[PDB]
Design a protein around this ligand. Structure first.
Ligand code: ZN
Lengths: 245, 107, 98, 302, 145, 191
């Protein structure tokens, strides 16, 4: 009875439009002379918010996008549940999140269609959103979902977040090939540059060098030839071994 | 259980020392999309190529070619009316709603 | 008494799967890196990060090179890093350098 | 915890009798005919005067409200029987959602004139339907119906014979116990509990997760392909250390050239001769290469 | 590339996005658990992902290398190194508008800072706790008033 | 040190003169109490609760002593205090120098091969942004900071504009709270 006169409801959408439904400018200069004369709080309040105001106004990008019905995805691989041996497997759960959703848009979607006291839909809907969010992060809002053992679960969010900040990531040193680590002695017989040399050391290590060398004195075949002979460990080795040295 | 084993993945692992050349010649589809798109779907040197094709747009795409086969194939789901010719006699229905005709036709 | 030329590598973070059969393959520190800095051998480090770190490629790749002993496959790109991006996007994150 | 806000929220609903519907359906349903014969009207047009349309389509509004309306005045039940089967499967709600369905379904499924707490009926659909539901979105990789079927059956068994055995059975003791090969049960459980996420960190601190400490058997050697093509093309070279045809002859002899073995007539077909003629020269030039220097030249490729 | 300004920054439109994803899917699903082989709409249209196997149109059909750059009339997929999976990208699609957390979830999340509105509430919108004025007459409620 | 870096406040806070003129000390109940005749003179900057522990200072022409004429940066008592003031009253010029010495100085306590720069080097640091007191018309929330060098840089933008009456100021900036100041997002992102 009346209705004809407007639109009143909820959801982005409506809102969304409210994005649409908007001018900077208006708001802009608005807050402009706002602060220009009135002041404080309010001003400060505005003022500030006038910030972001410009934030857009400025660049040619719309808050519009802030709404959501298209969405991307993790490519495969990324969320892998590769077989844990012993007939076992493990992946990016979360995927679940996806799922879940899938179950939903598929679901309350698949509802649609039918139609009913929405509530229902609302219920999910939001429920979705939520669940999504969860995607974003978990109990960040409310009760964080937690796998059995109430194990809460890794959010979007995470990643370069938490210790595993691919941030943090790099800044950490790590183990790598050919780790000359051992005790030591001087060697009176010394000359700068000079230094110890437990041989069977990179002896062991160096190898790949000659490994291409070697059969250059065609005395192995491939390298498995040599190599495998690296297992043989053969007086010859000590030699051009020398060279590479 | 701290003690590294190897889980186990899935999927081959070519030594397919790649080149580029000499390969298999191809061909293309480009089918038209609802919107109009032509997600141009190349193909091997030869083969059948569809009439349509579900678009990377998740939608689908009939030929990029004015070929143009058929659309039909759909079919209805159930109606609660269908559930009526189900568990109900029409002329009963017929009336019942007719009775209604009385009712709101009654005031 | 150990080091490690190579061997196993975290089926995840394929780093030197250290172990019995393995020499572990010593981990490395961050200061250190800073030392570099105090020089800047870049590469070097970088390299590491790439190389013996877990440069799947050059590992393979220059590993070859090596194998073929030649003006080594010059240092490439933080790759993975590449991922990122993706990783970002991921959240409507798209941007870019130019 | 919305639902709470729901639940309550939903409690806004207003329960009712068990006969309003008697009509209502008579209503409503009277609607289904309303559009129905209505639809006839539309088809011929032949529209009855405005009033006919208001009291009709309007009365269609009757059936609408009255139904939904009641449906609502039934969810509290929905709602109810829903509550309990938790601690397993799906979002309490979502769960519901599917309950709502078995509703929905059974909903439009009940001849009231039959005289039944249909709701109770629906309690198929209701129950069942969702029962399926679990039989639906249970696993991230679920299981073929039958399998689980006999499974639930099984693990149920498990309880049976630990609980009752005062201690869990023993495979064999079960396979026979349940009358099969224990291997069977094994694979079952293998189907039971999923093989864990990985996303769980490494059990502890824990500063790694699951994976952290594994490296698949499947493992890039550094010398394969490597050689392999060293091989491989190195071969090809050798593949030229003699004549000609003998290629596709032999390359085809395993499709080696085109990646697909064949038949003496398949190839020689090309040269036109005889499987005879084919494998004759074939195995011969083998002998050629069956020769050793033919070999060691590629032997370490062994 | 070697020659990189800095990294100008922003988001993306569903376009982009949609303009990006190798399609989407729709099946809380993945592979055959048993045969061990993924699905479609369920996680892992390798087709829109890539094999797990180097140049091998999932309809097996091919697996060579001269086979390459190829579209699969059969299993639609192409031909090469899965990995590009990972490297590919897929999207998601809703049944209605939705929101990004922050300026909502944030704190003090903009949205108000973006709109100057009853956050707490507002939310209520997104959490649908009470409608609000998404349009207005002034005309009928004008003149007609 | 440490805080001597992070420049919070000396628990051994020590009063520090201001203008000059003489001084009307007046100790007591440990809490001394004093009042320096500003050379202005007139209104004397006064101090009261001045526990005897941190008893008076000295100054050669030696020992602290009331009545005497007074000094500007003149640290009142023995002990440490708020360089934040020294600036706030004198800018870093010494301060800097202060600091510095205060640090070497420490190494002095250790006697070590030391050179200054390091700090210098620093120095350049915690002083780099001025505050953001009064945009006047630069529309930058008060209190806030800016690369000084900006604002300035900014300012120029002033170009009249109505003489963009932006107000910011000298600014210590605590290594951490420091550091916060930056630009490479992704950095603090790592933070
Ligand atoms: Zn295929």
């Amino acid at each position: 009875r009346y209705g004809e006169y407007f639109t009143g409801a909820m959801g982005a959408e409506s809102i969304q439009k409210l994005i649409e439904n908007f001018d900077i400018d208006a708001e802009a200069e608005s807050l402009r002379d706002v602060i220009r004369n009135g002041k404080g709080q309010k001003k400060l309040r505005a003022l500030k918010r006038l910030k972001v105001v410009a934030a857009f106004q400025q660049s040619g990008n719309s808050p519009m996008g802030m709404v959501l019905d298209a969405v991307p995805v993790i490519p495969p691989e990324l969320r892998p549940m590769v077989q844990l041996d012993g007939g076992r497997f493990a992946t990016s759960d979360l995927n679940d999140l996806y799922r879940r959703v899938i179950n939903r848009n598929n679901r309350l979607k698949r509802l649609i269609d039918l139609g009913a006291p929405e509530i229902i839909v609302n219920n999910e809907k939001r429920m979705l959103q939520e669940s999504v969010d969860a995607l974003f992060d978990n109990g960040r809002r409310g009760r964080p979902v937690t796998g059995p053992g109430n194990r809460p679960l890794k959010s979007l969010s995470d990643l370069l977040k938490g210790k595993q900040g691919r941030f943090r990531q790099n800044l950490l040193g790590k183990r790598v090939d050919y780790s000359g680590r051992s005790v030591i002695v001087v060697g009176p017989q010394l000359k700068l540059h000079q230094c110890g040399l437990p041989k069977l050391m990179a002896l062991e290590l160096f190898k790949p060098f000659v490994m291409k060398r070697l059969v250059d004195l065609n005395h192995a075949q491939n390298i498995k030839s040599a190599k495998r002979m690296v297992e043989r460990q053969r007086p010859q080795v000590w030699d051009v071994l020398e060279e590479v040295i | 259980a701290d003690r590294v084993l190897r889980g186990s993945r899935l999927g081959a692992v070519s030594y397919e020392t790649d080149r580029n050349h000499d390969l298999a010649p191809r061909q293309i589809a480009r089918y038209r999309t609802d919107n109009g798109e032509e997600f141009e779907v190349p193909f091997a040197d030869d083969a059948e190529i569809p009439g349509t094709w579900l678009c990377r747009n998740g939608m689908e795409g009939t030929l990029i070619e004015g070929d143009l086969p058929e659309p039909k194939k759909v079919k209805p789901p159930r109606t609660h009316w269908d559930m009526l010719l189900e568990r109900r006699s029409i002329e009963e229905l017929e009336e019942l709603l007719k009775e209604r005709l009385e009712l709101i036709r009654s005031r | 008494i150990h080091a490690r030329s190579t061997g196993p590598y975290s089926m995840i973070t394929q780093q030197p799967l250290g172990g019995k059969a393995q020499f572990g393959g010593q981990r490395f520190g961050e200061m250190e890196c800073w030392a570099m800095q105090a020089y800047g051998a870049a590469y070097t480090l970088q390299e590491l990060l790439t190389i013996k770190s877990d440069d799947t490629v050059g590992r393979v790749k220059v590993y070859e090179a090596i194998v073929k002993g030649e003006n080594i496959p010059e240092p490439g790109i933080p790759e993975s890093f590449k991922v990122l991006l993706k990783e970002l996007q991921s959240l409507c994150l798209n941007v870019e350098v130019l | 915890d919305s639902v709470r806000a729901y639940l309550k929220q939903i409690g806004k609903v207003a329960l009712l009798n068990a006969e309003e519907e008697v009509e209502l359906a008579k209503r409503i349903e009277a609607g289904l005919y309303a559009t129905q014969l209505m639809t006839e009207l539309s088809e011929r047009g032949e529209k009855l005067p405005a009033a006919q349309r208001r009291d009709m389509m309007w009365i269609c509004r009757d059936g609408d409200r009255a139904k939904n309306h009641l449906l609502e005045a039934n969810l509290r039940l929905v709602v109810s029987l829903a509550k309990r089967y938790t601690g397993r499967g799906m979002a309490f709600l979502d769960l519901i959602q599917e309950g709502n369905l078995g509703l929905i379904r059974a909903v439009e499924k009940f001849d009231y004139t039959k005289g039944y707490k249909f709701s109770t009926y629906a309690t198929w659909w209701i129950r069942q339907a969702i029962t399926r539901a679990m039989a639906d979105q249970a696993r991230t990789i679920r299981i073929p119906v039958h399998m689980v079927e006999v499974i639930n059956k099984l693990g149920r068994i498990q309880r049976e014979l630990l609980q009752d055995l005062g201690r869990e059975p023993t495979p064999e003791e079960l396979a026979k116990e349940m009358d099969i090969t224990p291997e069977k049960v094994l694979e079952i459980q293998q189907y039971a509990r999923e093989p864990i996420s990985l996303d769980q960190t490494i059990g502890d601190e824990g500063d790694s997760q699951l994976g952290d400490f594994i490296e698949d058997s499947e493992a890039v050697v550094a010398v394969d392909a490597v050689s392999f093509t060293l091989l491989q093309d190195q071969l090809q070279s050798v593949l030229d250390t003699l004549s000609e045809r003998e290629a596709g002859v032999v390359r085809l002899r395993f499709g080696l050239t085109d990646g697909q073995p064949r038949t003496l007539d398949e190839i020689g077909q090309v040269y036109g001769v005889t499987r005879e003629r084919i494998r004759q020269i074939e195995s011969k030039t083998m002998s050629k290469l069956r020769h050793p220097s033919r070999s060691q030249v590629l032997r370490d490729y062994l | 590339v070697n020659f990189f300004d800095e990294l100008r920054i922003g988001l993306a439109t569903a376009e982009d996005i949609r303009q990006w994803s190798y399609g989407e899917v729709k099946k809380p699903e993945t592979i055959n658990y048993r045969t061990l082989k993924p699905e479609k709409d369920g996680l892992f249209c390798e087709k829109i992902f890539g094999p797990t196997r180097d140049w091998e149109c999932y309809c097996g059909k091919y697996k060579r290398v001269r086979f390459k750059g190829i579209i699969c009339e059969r299993c639609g997929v192409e031909v090469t190194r899965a990995k590009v999976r990972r490297e590919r990208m897929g999207h998601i699609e809703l049944a209605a508008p939705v929101t990004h957390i922050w300026y909502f979830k944030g704190v003090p999340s903009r949205l108000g800072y973006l709109l100057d509105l009853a956050p707490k509430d507002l939310e209520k919108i997104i959490y649908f706790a009470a409608y609000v004025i998404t349009s207005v007459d002034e005309e009928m409620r004008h003149n007609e008033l | 040190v440490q805080e001597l870096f992070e420049a919070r406040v000396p628990r051994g806070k020590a009063p520090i003169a201001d203008v000059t003129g003489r001084v009307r000390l007046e100790d007591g109940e440990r809490f001394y109490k004093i009042t320096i005749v500003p050379d202005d003179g007139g209104e004397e900057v006064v101090y009261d609760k001045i526990s005897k522990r941190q008893r008076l200072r000295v100054f050669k022409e030696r020992v602290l002593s009331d009545g005497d004429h007074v000094e500007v940066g003149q640290q009142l008592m023995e002990g440490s205090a708020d360089p934040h003031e020294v600036l706030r009253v004198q800018g870093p010029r010494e301060v800097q120098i202060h600091l510095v010495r205060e640090v070497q100085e420490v190494y002095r306590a250790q006697g070590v091969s030391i050179h200054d720069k390091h700090i210098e080097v620093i120095v350049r640091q915690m002083l780099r942004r001025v505050t953001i007191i009064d945009s006047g018309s630069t529309e930058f929330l008060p209190g806030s900071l800016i690369d000084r060098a900006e604002f300035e840089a900014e300012n120029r933008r002033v170009v009249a504009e109505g003489g963009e009456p932006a107000a910011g100021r000298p600014v210590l900036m605590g290594i951490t709270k420091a550091s916060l100041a930056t630009d490479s997002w992704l950095s603090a992102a790592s933070f």
